Each structure stands twice: as C-alpha cells, then as structure tokens.
Amino acid sequence: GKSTTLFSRHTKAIVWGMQTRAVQGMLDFDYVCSRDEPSVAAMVYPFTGDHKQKFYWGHKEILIPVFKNMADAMRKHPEVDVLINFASLRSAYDSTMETMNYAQIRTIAIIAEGIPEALTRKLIKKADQKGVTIIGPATVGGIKPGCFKIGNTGGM
Amino acid sequence: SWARELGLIRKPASFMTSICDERGQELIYAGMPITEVFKEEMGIGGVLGLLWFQKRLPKYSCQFIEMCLMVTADHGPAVSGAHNTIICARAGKDLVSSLTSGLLTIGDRFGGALDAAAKMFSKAFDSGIIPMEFVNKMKKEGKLIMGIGHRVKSINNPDMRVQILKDYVRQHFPATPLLDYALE
Amino acid sequence: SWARELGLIRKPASFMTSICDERGQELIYAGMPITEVFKEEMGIGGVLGLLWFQKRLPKYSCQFIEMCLMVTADHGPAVSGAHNTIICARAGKDLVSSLTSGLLTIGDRFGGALDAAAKMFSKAFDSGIIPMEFVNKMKKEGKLIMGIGHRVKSINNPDMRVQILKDYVRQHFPATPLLDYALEVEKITTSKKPNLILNVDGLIGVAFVDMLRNCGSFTREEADEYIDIGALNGIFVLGRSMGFIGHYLDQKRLKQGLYRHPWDDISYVLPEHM
Amino acid sequence: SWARELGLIRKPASFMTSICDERGQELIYAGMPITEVFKEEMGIGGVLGLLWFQKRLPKYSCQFIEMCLMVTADHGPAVSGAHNTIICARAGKDLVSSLTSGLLTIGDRFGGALDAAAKMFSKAFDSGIIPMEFVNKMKKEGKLIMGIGHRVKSINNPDMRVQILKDYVRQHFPATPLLDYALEVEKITTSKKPNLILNVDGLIGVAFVDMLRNCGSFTREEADEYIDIGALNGIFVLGRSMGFIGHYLDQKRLKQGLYRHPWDDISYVLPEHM
Numbered sequence A: 001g002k003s004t005t006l007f008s009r010h011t012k013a014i015v016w017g018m019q020t021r022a023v024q025g026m027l028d029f030d031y032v033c034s035r036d037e038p039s040v041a042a043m044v045y046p047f048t049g050d051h052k053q054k055f056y057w058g059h060k061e062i063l064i065p066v067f068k069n070m071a072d073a074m075r076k077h078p079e080v081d082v083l084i085n086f087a088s089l090r091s092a093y094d095s096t097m098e099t100m101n102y103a104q105i106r107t108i109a110i111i112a113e114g115i116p117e118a119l120t121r122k123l124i125k126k127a128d129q130k131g132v133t134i135i136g137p138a139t140v141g142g143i144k145p146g147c148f149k150i151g152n153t154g155g156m
Numbered sequence B: 001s002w003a004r005e006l007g008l009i010r011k012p013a014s015f016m017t018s019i020c021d022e023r024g025q026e027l028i029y030a031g032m033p034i035t036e037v038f039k040e041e042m043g044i045g046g047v048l049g050l051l052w053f054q055k056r057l058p059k060y061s062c063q064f065i066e067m068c069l070m071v072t073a074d075h076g077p078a079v080s081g082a083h084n085t086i087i088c089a090r091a092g093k094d095l096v097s098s099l100t101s102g103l104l105t106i107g108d109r110f111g112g113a114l115d116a117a118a119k120m121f122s123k124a125f126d127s128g129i130i131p132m133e134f135v136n137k138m139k140k141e142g143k144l145i146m147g148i149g150h151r152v153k154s155i156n157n158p159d160m161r162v163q164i165l166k167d168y169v170r171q172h173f174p175a176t177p178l179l180d181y182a183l184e
Numbered sequence C, D: 001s002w003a004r005e006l007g008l009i010r011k012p013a014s015f016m017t018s019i020c021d022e023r024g025q026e027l028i029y030a031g032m033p034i035t036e037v038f039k040e041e042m043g044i045g046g047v048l049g050l051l052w053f054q055k056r057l058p059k060y061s062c063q064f065i066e067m068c069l070m071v072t073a074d075h076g077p078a079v080s081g082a083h084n085t086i087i088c089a090r091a092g093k094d095l096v097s098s099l100t101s102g103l104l105t106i107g108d109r110f111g112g113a114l115d116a117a118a119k120m121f122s123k124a125f126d127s128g129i130i131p132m133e134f135v136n137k138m139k140k141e142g143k144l145i146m147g148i149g150h151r152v153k154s155i156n157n158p159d160m161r162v163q164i165l166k167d168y169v170r171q172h173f174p175a176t177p178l179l180d181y182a183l184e185v186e187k188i189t190t191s192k193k194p195n196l197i198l199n200v201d202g203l204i205g206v207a208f209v210d211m212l213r214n215c216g217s218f219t220r221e222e223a224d225e226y227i228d229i230g231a232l233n234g235i236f237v238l239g240r241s242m243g244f245i246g247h248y249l250d251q252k253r254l255k256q257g258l259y260r261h262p263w264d265d266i267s268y269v270l271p272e273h274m
C-alpha cells in the first residue's frame, strides 16, 4: 500500500549523485522553514570512496557523509524514507531497481530526462508491487512548504 | 691508485650507469658523442631519446617529445604544484627549493594522469576488448576512465592543445592503434 | 572583510584542520592549551600524541614514543639517507636542503620496515593463524618477513636497542599480544638461523601497533587507520631527522669539500653507438 | 677486501663523520653507547646534544631543548610550510613528500627568525653597545629587529609560550646575559608600541645562544660556530616537523580531495601580446 503523507518535518533523504548544489538548496530550505534537522542524511556517489562533504546549515557548517555503495548508506541510516535519484538517463533504471529492494525507502524521486518507456514501465510495475511512490521521471521534483523540498525544485 | 694503475688489484664497482660516459675527450651520450648530437640536428627530444631510452629516435618522435614538453608546461598558478612553487617563492627561498616544493606534488591526483591514462588504455587494448565493453567495464567498478573529460572545452569546442597534438599524431606518425582505441 | 565582520555573506572554507588552533589568546594543541601542555608535564611524546593522534596518551606511551624517537635517530653515515644528507652538505647547500635530500629516501627499502613490519604482523595476527603457520606461509611466496633479522647481533649477542625497547614494552605496558606473536615468530626463526632476531624496525612496528590498539584512547578503527595512513613512517622520519641534522652540522663543522665519487667505482656499461 | 683484510693496501677515506659509530656491538652516539644513553636518562634533548654538538649537555639544557622542540611544533595551518604540507597531502602523495614540500619553505621569511634573531642580538651584544643605542642603530638603517613583535599578545597580555620558556631560562639556568640584553631591548621597544614584545622565535634564539656560551661544554669558538653553521635552523625544523607530520596525518584522516585554488583570488596581470 502507498502512503498518504510522503513528506514531513522528520523526513530524511539519501541523494544519489554528486549534487552538492541541490543538497545545499535543500538545507537552505530547511533552515528557512525553521526545521530541526537536515533533509539529507547521506549521498551516494559510486565513483569515489566514503568521505564527508561540507555543507551549510544557516551560518553553521555541517558534514554529510558521501558513501560509495547504497547498502552502506542504508545500513548507517535507517530513518531515511525517501531517495532522490539524480542519475542520468542510462543509469537511473539500475539505481531505482537497486533502490526498490530496500524496505525503508517509501518514496523515490527520479530526475532524469529521457529514460526509455519500457524501462520506466518496469519501474512503475515494481513500484506498484513493492508499494513505493515514485515521483515520476523527467521531473524537477516536488516541494512541500514547511517540511521538505526535492532537490532543485523552487530554484534559488 | 698505484696498485690499480698498474692493475694488480680488483675491485667490484657499483653504479652500473648505461648512460652518459663523461670520461674521455668528448661527452658521449647513450652511445653518441655530443658533436654528433649537435651535428645530426637532434633537439631536446633527441637528447631525451638518448638519455632516457638510450635510443636514436626518428625525427618525428623527437619533435613529438618536444611538442609534449611544450604543452605540459605551465597550466596557470591555480593548480597544486604551481601553488606550492609560488608559496615557496614568496617565502623567499631560492629556485631549487621553490621548483622542488612544487615538483613534489606530481603524484597521482596532480600530474599522474599521464602514466595512469596510458596504463589503463594499454591494459584495456592488450586484453583484447572492444571500447564499448571497456567503458561499461569501467562503469561497474567505480574508477572513472583516466584521461577522459574536460570541465569547459567539450565538443564543437575542442581543447586546441589536444588538437595540435592529435593532428601531429595523425600526420607524422605511422600505425597508431591505441590512439584509435582512445578515440573510439 | 566588512561584509563578513557584520556577517551577511557566507563562504565555504577549505582546509578543515582538526589540529592546532593558532587563533585566540593561547596556542591550543589537539584540544589542550600550551600552558596545560607544559603544566601536565608531557614531553615530546605527549605533543606527538596531541598533534598526530589528537589524543592525550598515557604517561608510559609518551615515554615509549620518546624512546622510539631516541633509537630511530642516527644509524651511522653509511646508510642511504645519511649518505644523501652528507653529499648535500658537502655541496654547501643549507640545512633544509640537506635534511630534505636525505629525507627523500625514506621509502620502502630504507626506513620502510617500520610500517611494513607492522602491516605484515597485523595482517597475520588478525587473520588468526599461529606463528608456525605464518612463517611457512611467508616461505612459499618469496617475500621475507619484514622486521626479522640482523647482520651481526644474533642470539647470545642481543641488539641492545631492541632490548631496551623490549624491556620497556614488557614492564610499563599492559596487554601486548602482537609483540608476543612477533616473539613467537622470533623463537621459530632463531631456530633456522642464529641471526634472525627482531629488528628495531620490526619491534617498534609491532610494539606501536600494541601501543595503539592495546592501551586506551583508540577503539580498533582509529588504531588501524593510524596504521594504514602512515603514522609509523612519521616515527622513523622524525627520529632520523635528528641524525640527519647532526650529519649536516658535522659535515659543516669538519669543513669538507665537494664530493666527486671516483670513476673506478662506477663501471660504465653504455651501448655501442646509439 | 682480501688485500685490506690482511692490510697490505692503503686507501684514503672520505666522509670523516665525527658522529654515530654504527660498527661494533653497540650503537655509539657522540662518544656514548646507546645503553648509556638510556641508562643516564637523557631524553631527546640529550640525544640532540650528542648528535648535534657531540657533547653531554647538563640536565637543564636538555630539558630546555625539549621545551623548544615543544613550542616550535605546530602553529596552525595558515602559515606557509603547513600550507604547503596540506596542499601536498591533499594531492595524495605520501608522508615524506608532504613533510618535505612543507619543510622546504623554512628559509628567511618563514622560520628563519630563530637564527637571525640570534645573530643580530649576538652581533649587538658582542660589539659592546647598550640596548638604547642598538634600537636606534637599527632605526637608522631600515631592517627591523628580528625577534621583536607580536600581532596580538602585547603587554598586560603576554604570549604564554614566550612566558613558559622565559620562566624556564630564569630559574634553571645560570648566567644569562644575552637574554637580559634582549629583555632590555624589550623594555625599550614596549615603550614605543604595546605589541613589540619578544617573539618565541627571538627568545629561543637568544636563550639558545645563552645556552651555548653560558653553560659548560662550549668555549666561545665552538659556541659561535654552532650559531653560524646553522644549529638554530635545526631546532625550528625538527620542532616543526612534528606539526607538519601531524598536518599530513590530519588531512589523510579527514580524506580531503585535490586543492584547486579559485580563480577569484589570483588576478592575472599578463602582458598584451608577447
């Protein structure tokens, strides 16, 4: 079954990709929405090792861990219930298929423009089998004011 | 010195040096005297062929070595070794300490794509896989292909020092299979 | 500066530096001010514990670090880095270029048995094999056990700086399992040859892994990261810098000229006509 | 080897080395074996006295050498050599290349106030002029007094590592005339500005000249040769190597990437068309 409250003020995210501008926009949105905690718990970039990226929480500087594998990102963070998939058109299918066998991820946001339609049909059918809510491909994201903002939606 | 001048004592030598006989009436390089170096009209690429490989390279290969030394010259002061040389020069040191403090950053992250981007393409070309399988092989392991990518000059906007080199290797240079593999 | 003094602009910073706050009224080390450094009576081993590990080490571990810096000092002028420092000092350079030209030989063959003789014994002890199988495992692959063997000081003739360290680690130092493993490998190898004893470059490696993972302050992923990042090359380099500066000052005080290296030690083997 | 083993051939030797006999059954330092080094309980200051000066220094002078190595350790990552070590460590090199790339900036502007602030005060004190004429002599030539001045810690706000050293040299340390001369120059210069105090790089220089020429063991031509050959650059380099290795291990433990230095800090001023 699909949820009805996708986002909240305790929603934590995992971002697939090296998207520090989008993560910083999400943290800036969280600071201007008087939120307690950042929206992004980790980042997943498979082409480098496990390190920490430096981001801003208002005036203060925080660190967000950049993991290499997605299983390492799910083991350290069980409170993450949304994944934002900034993968390209040729690697969003594999990333989403590898995402959907984790039961903690309740909703996925796919950003890529041009995923071929049989592949996104398979993504739709596995999301309907597993019960996760895919915010559809070729989107900018979604914004719930006060709680959560997906990536680069809204803009600056 | 007297017992070895008349040759009645034997000492094993270290430092076997297959390069640059300084003894005698002329400075010999690899096997070639310095008057033959300047008489055969080989430049700095010729003497790199003599000192580094101990071989008389053909006249296009010496000019390609000179061209590579001309494009691997300065790349602005922002980069890591140029930064260290400037921090050293502003501390008032001397030429050798400044050059040396900047040279000791040419490792793997700065300046090590020359050797890694050749070992990788050589281990891919000599294993006998087509390029469309090599890109996907390096796509399932992490580890981006070394020697691929620019931040600005892309396509319909070439790098214009990759291009001078590339049209040197296309014209004066027979049988170039690994560059064809890299272009695929 | 005015827009950041009144705080209306934000800049991301580089150079994250979890070491040595120079700003403020006192020089703070790891988290400890310099007046507390000299008031708690920690020596150079204490400030290596503060600068290198960011931890207040116990008073035996600081003294062991000082003892390791005292034995990894000079080992004569014949060895490779001391040779380079002397060739540099006789060319009339300066202290930094001489020390530096000798320091840039501490690699794998000279000065790299500290870190390799600890990685090897740690990868053998944490894999869970008895020493009598580790010696034969390193006997079927080539690759001699790093940190085993002396040319002269053998057995019934100990090395006497391996011994001062070894009786420091036996007395002031609780729970030392990797040194016991290395001494069992020593018992096995001294039956093969008389001169297969623990080096100083192997005993400092295994006793420093025992110092990291066996006292307080380190869990086991800090203690292995400091053994993998290279904090054991730093012990040899900081110890041997005293000997190399002593060699520079020695060749400046004896007033020796430029070195030329005579041609009957060289044996030129050049090609015929290239 | 056979003709020299039975001794019928003679070879002149190079590399005269009045330091560290490695041959024999024990490592001998200056003239003292390593078991006597650890038995007489001399620390790293004792083995610097043995390797650098070839002299058994008294027990306060060794502790002062250790104290100077403890204060000439890290001084934050902003300074020039620490910066070079961090730029080198973030390029992923190794410990020796990083330490070395940072050590090759200790020259005249960074790290050379130790030796210059001792040569200047020694050439002023041995010429036989009162401090009130030395300040005005260095006022008519340009060339500010090396070893005088701090940016922040001034007076009624002391530097607190100049102070630990200064109360070490006042207590455990007989007959210190050049430090008294430097403190009279300090009394004269703190009337001009509030922030013209003795540096740590000037107080270690003048207190080390007092250590050499004022205790035993040095006459006055050994004590001036060690001040002219460069044994005060070695104190800063050996102290600051602890901080630079700590900076390398810190940037390897924080796992930072290659540094690029943004273009809006550079201001290219190139010619028109050369």
Ligand SMILES: CC(C)(COP(=O)(O)OP(=O)(O)OC[C@H]1O[C@@H](n2cnc3c(N)ncnc32)[C@H](O)[C@@H]1OP(=O)(O)O)[C@@H](O)C(=O)NCCC(=O)NCCS
Pocket: A017, A086, A087, A088, A089, A090, A091, A111, A112, A113, A137, A138, A139, A140, B139, B144, B145, B146, B148, B149
């Ligand atoms: C995120 C986004 C930019 C895609 O990224 P991208 O431009 O493909 O850049 P990426 O780094 O993700 O991928 C670049 C590709 O080049 C490859 N590559 C990168 N560096 C490389 C190197 N050094 N060597 C070899 N190959 C390399 C990568 O493998 C990758 O392809 P992959 O799928 O095989 O991994 C895209 O989703 C986007 O436009 N974002 C906003 C979403 C949007 O607006 N779209 C919806 C309607 S507009």
